[PDB]
């Protein structure tokens, strides 16, 4: 075989995991929407792509969402000019579909499990309460003169009212622009200025992991260089003293107490913008309304096999696309219960995720490989003595998951009775692009497996620009046709949208990730194209080498980067984080490095061995958990963790 799975300890012949009994409709669990086998996935998926797929999409759109005006055209437009359109004559409102319609059916159903930073302050927020607060905030925004199409910035931490703020903007047709709470005054300022908002929603402070986010102080420093912001609405989350500018700043509770607890829904065109989401110049990714909402609704239902009484626990942050799509929009559109988790995986202790699961009897958990590796670094007794049997599906998103981490997840979070859904997608795709359907697909550790409904993906050889036909091929991932939830533009910079996604391989969407299709047709997403390392013609992916390294005992997490080398073209440089109890004095470091190199050669090949290996306490990571390999690549080529890496490279 040309294409290999990511390195694992389990032989490939013992590494295929069929959907387990909790996803077979046994033990009183819901029967899967799609099952029981690969063929049942294909039979349904084939209706969603190709020249006769309008029928399925029109039916799903009409069955999944409540519309004010029906659409007439299913899809139009394309990559070349970025004029993608779905359901364009239709009208609807995201707030109506995430709140009103469920409130009318069962107003006392829990919409949000609000898991506070302190476990004792947690509570359930009914659909009724969420909708009432959403309408109050909507009424407040309208009283500031916010109109359909205006941008509103949101600088909120992970408290449940973040959902009300998003949905209040959606209710009146304002375009929300959420900024991760804890970004600097400079970074907030850049995003506030770019979207030209006149209103900002924030908190006095946030609380995360027992620490204080000085959100209002950050805001005050940012707004000194934001001439357009006229109104700031401040949620009294801690009640500790914070500065308040007269006229500009008002308290959330005092404003909302003046307003009615209902507010009508603005009737939005399918293609009206729903939100801008900046990704780190900051790219303002724009999603419209109907296709984005339909895509989040469908992926949530089918990738996590959501059923009406489920309690879906996505542990991400609403500042991230993962929080947009699988905390707020996806789960609320489906009318189920969604978690807003305010803390960290290790606060107060690393048992927190599993205390949370057992407390609330969560049925699906969705988190990042960075969190999984973190909890793996902390040992098995924080999870061994938990029930966790309410879970059926375990999700991973954000980066390739090393099969070693996949097994830890499977063994201890799932007790070998959950399906593991490795979900590949991006801010720009709006919703999950490639993922196993848990009641149909037999999983391989580290493989996203098969494309979602509406996704028709190919592998292009970047050295020729041409599509590689068949299986057992590797290259760069591309999509052949638009899908309902694709980002529609980059805010006021459409040329950069076209140049970034539509120009590199004309006729296709370019994800920017390297990928492989193995002999069974399973997709393997192996890292960013920019992070590929070319050693003497051998194009190595980051996930390959990093998965090899973590197979060594004591390794907690690694990152590899390439650097210029006059003999091999490029050479591999590895940064390795060992588990904290590992005895660095008993094992001579020069011996560890040699055993690591030897391990990489066995699984991958002789060329793949690192030229150098740096031992570090941590890697530079974004708030979402992405490893900043571009930073490490530069330090090799000439917050506080980066200064330590530069020092260790000298």
Phi, psi of 155 (to 5 degrees): -125, 70
601 is in an annotated binding site: yes
Measured from the CB of residue 280, what is the shortest distance to ligand PRX in angstroms? Answer: 8
433 lies in the site for ligand PRX, by CB under 6 A: no
136 is in an annotated binding site: no
317 is in an annotated binding site: yes
Q: Which of 199, 213, 448, 632 binds ligand PRX (CB under 6 A)?
A: 448
322 lies in the site for ligand PRX, by CB under 6 A: yes
426 lies in the site for ligand PRX, by CB under 6 A: yes
Name the H helices within 125-172.
127-143, 161-172
208 is in an annotated binding site: yes
Beta carbons of 466 and 521 less than 8 angstroms apart: no
Q: CA of 281: how far to CAs of 187, 190, 496, 571, in Å?
A: 10, 9, 11, 29
Stretch that binds ligand PRX, among 203-211, 245-253, 417-425, 453-461 (CB under 6 A): 417-425
626 is in an annotated binding site: yes
Beta carbons of 344 and 373 less than 8 angstroms apart: no
Measured from the CB of residue 316, what is the shortest distance to ligand PRX in angstroms? Answer: 8
| Residues numbered 510-529 forming contacts with ligand PRX, rule: CB under 6 A | 511-513, 525, 528
What DSSP string describes 327-388? Answer: IIIHHHHTT-EEEEE-S-TTSS-TTHHHHHHHHHT-SEEEE-HHHHHHHHTT-SHHHHT---
Q: CA of 5: how far to CAs of 8, 75, 476, 552, 644, in Å?
A: 8, 36, 16, 18, 33
Distance, in Å, from the CA atom of 388 to the CA atom of 383, rounded to the nearest integer, reads: 9
Cβ neighbors of 332 (< 8 A, separation 6 or more) are: 97, 98, 99, 102, 111, 163, 167, 338
Measured from the CB of residue 607, what is the shortest distance to ligand PRX in angstroms? Answer: 23
- Which residue in the shown chain puts its C-beta closest to ligand PRX? 427
289 is in an annotated binding site: no
Measured from the CB of residue 181, what is the shortest distance to ligand PRX in angstroms? Answer: 17
Helix axis angle for 54-64 and 290-303, nearest 10°, is 90
Rank residues 242 and 321 by Cβ distance to ligand PRX and give the closer one: 321
Tokens of 431: 């919703």
494 prior amide bond cis, ω within 30: no
| Residues numbered 275-294 forming contacts with ligand PRX, rule: CB under 6 A | 279
Q: Which of 91, 153, 423, 547 binds ligand PRX (CB under 6 A)?
A: 423
398 lies in the site for ligand PRX, by CB under 6 A: yes
Measured from the CB of residue 456, what is the shortest distance to ligand PRX in angstroms? Answer: 18
Measured from the CB of residue 443, what is the shortest distance to ligand PRX in angstroms? Answer: 12
Tokens of 19: 């959907």
Rg for the chain (alpha carbons), in Å? Answer: 24
Specify the DSSP element, H or E, that contains 313: strand 311-314
595 is in an annotated binding site: no
> How many residues lie near ligand PRX (CB under 6 A)?
20
Stretch that binds ligand PRX, among 122-130, 215-223, 396-404, 633-641 (CB under 6 A): 396-404
Distance, in Å, from the CA atom of 169 to the CA atom of 154, rounded to the nearest integer, reads: 10
Rank residues 282 and 512 by Cβ distance to ligand PRX and give the closer one: 512
Q: Which of 275, 278, 424, 497 binds ligand PRX (CB under 6 A)?
A: 424
427 lies in the site for ligand PRX, by CB under 6 A: yes
Cβ neighbors of 632 (< 8 A, separation 6 or more) are: 559, 561, 573, 575, 619, 620, 645
425 lies in the site for ligand PRX, by CB under 6 A: yes
Cβ neighbors of 52 (< 8 A, separation 6 or more) are: none
Stretch that binds ligand PRX, among 19-27, 71-79, 292-300, 507-515 (CB under 6 A): 507-515
Beta carbons of 509 and 476 less than 8 angstroms apart: no
Stretch that binds ligand PRX, among 137-145, 201-209, 212-220, 398-406 (CB under 6 A): 398-406
422 lies in the site for ligand PRX, by CB under 6 A: yes
Q: Please compute, for residue 243, the number of CA atoms within 13 A of its CA located in the half-sphere on the CB side.
A: 11
528 is in an annotated binding site: yes
80 is in an annotated binding site: yes
Q: Which of 5, 291, 400, 403 binds ligand PRX (CB under 6 A)?
A: 400
Please give the annotated binding residues for ATP, written as ranges: 280, 427, 528, 626
Summarize the annotated binding site for CoA as residue ranges.
208, 317, 537, 601
The contact set with ligand PRX (CB under 6 A) reads 279, 321-322, 397-400, 422-427, 448, 511-513, 525, 528, 624
Binding residues: 80, 208, 280, 317, 427, 528, 537, 601, 626
Residues marked as binding for Mg(2+)?
Answer: 80
């Amino acid at each position: 075989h040309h294409v290999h799975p990511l390195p694992d300890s389990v032989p490939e012949s013992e590494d295929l995991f069929a959907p387990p009994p909790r996803m077979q409709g046994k033990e009183g669990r819901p029967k899967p929407h799609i099952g029981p086998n690969y063929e049942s996935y294909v039979k349904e998926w084939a209706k969603t792509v190709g020249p006769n797929s309008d029928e399925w999409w029109a039916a799903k759109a009409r069955e999944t969402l409540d519309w004010y005006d029906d659409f007439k055209t299913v899809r139009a437009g394309g990559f070349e000019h970025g004029d993608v359109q779905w359901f364009p004559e239709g009208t609807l409102n995201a707030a109506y579909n995430c709140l009103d319609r469920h409130y009318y059916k069962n107003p006392k159903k829990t919409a949000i499990i609000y898991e506070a930073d302190e476990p004792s302050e947690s509570r359930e927020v009914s659909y009724e309460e969420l909708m009432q607060e959403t309408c109050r905030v909507a009424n407040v925004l309208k009283s500031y003169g916010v109109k359909k199409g205006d941008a509103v910035s949101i600088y909120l931490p992970m408290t449940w009212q973040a959902a009300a703020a998003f949905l209040a903007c959606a209710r009146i047709g304002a375009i929300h622009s959420a900024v991760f709470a804890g970004f600097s005054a400079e970074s907030l300022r850049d995003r506030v200025n770019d979207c030209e908002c006149k209103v900002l929603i924030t908190t006095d402070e946030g609380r995360r992991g027992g620490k204080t986010i000085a959100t209002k102080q950050i805001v005050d420093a940012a707004l000194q260089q934001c001439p357009l912001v006229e109104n700031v609405l401040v949620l009294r989350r801690t009640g500790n003293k914070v500065p308040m500018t007269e006229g500009r700043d008002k308290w959330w509770d005092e404003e909302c107490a003046k307003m009615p607890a209902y507010c009508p829904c603005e009737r939005m065109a399918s293609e009206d913008p729903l939100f801008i989401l900046y990704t780190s110049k900051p790219k303002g990714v724009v999603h419209s309304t109907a296709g984005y909402l339909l895509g989040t609704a469908l992926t949530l239902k089918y990738v996590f096999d959501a059923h009406p009484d489920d309690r879906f626990a996505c542990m991400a942050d609403i500042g991230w696309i993962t929080g947009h799509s699988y905390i707020i929009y996806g789960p609320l559109a489906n009318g189920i219960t969604t978690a807003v988790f305010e803390s960290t995986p290790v606060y107060p202790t690393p048992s927190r995720y599993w205390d949370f699961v057992d407390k609330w009897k969560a049925t699906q958990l969705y988190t990042a490989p960075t969190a999984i590796r973190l909890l793996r670094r902390m040992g098995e007794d924080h999870v061994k003595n938990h029930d966790l049997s309410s879970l059926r599906v375990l999700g991973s998103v954000g980066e390739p998951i090393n099969p070693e981490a996949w097994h830890w997840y499977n063994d201890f979070a799932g007790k070998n009775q959950c399906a593991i859904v490795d979900t590949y997608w991006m801010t720009e795709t709006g919703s999950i692009s490639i993922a196993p359907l848990p009641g149909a697909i037999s999983t391989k550790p580290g493989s996203a497996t098969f494309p979602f409904f509406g996704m028709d993906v190919d592998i292009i050889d970047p050295q020729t620009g041409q599509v590689l036909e068949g299986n057992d091929v590797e290259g760069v991932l591309v999509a052949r046709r638009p899908w309902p939830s694709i980002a529609r533009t980059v805010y006021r910079d459409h040329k950069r949208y076209l140049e970034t996604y539509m120009k590199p391989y004309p006729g296709y969407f370019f994800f920017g990730d390297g990928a492989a299709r193995d002999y069974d047709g399973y997709m393997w997403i192996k890292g960013r194209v920019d992070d590929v390392i070319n050693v003497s013609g051998h194009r190595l992916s980051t996930a390959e080498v990093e998965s090899a390294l973590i197979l060594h005992k004591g390794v907690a997490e690694t990152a590899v980067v390439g650097c210029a080398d006059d003999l091999t073209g490029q050479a591999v440089y590895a940064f390795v984080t060992m588990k904290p109890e590992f005895d660095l004095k008993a094992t001579k470091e020069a011996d560890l490095s040699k055993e690591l190199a030897i391990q990489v050669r066995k699984v991958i090949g002789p060329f793949a061995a690192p030229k150098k290996i740096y031992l570090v306490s941590d890697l530079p990571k974004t708030r979402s958990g992405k490893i900043m390999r571009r930073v490490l690549r530069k330090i090799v080529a000439g917050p506080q963790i980066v200064e330590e890496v530069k020092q260790k490279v000298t």
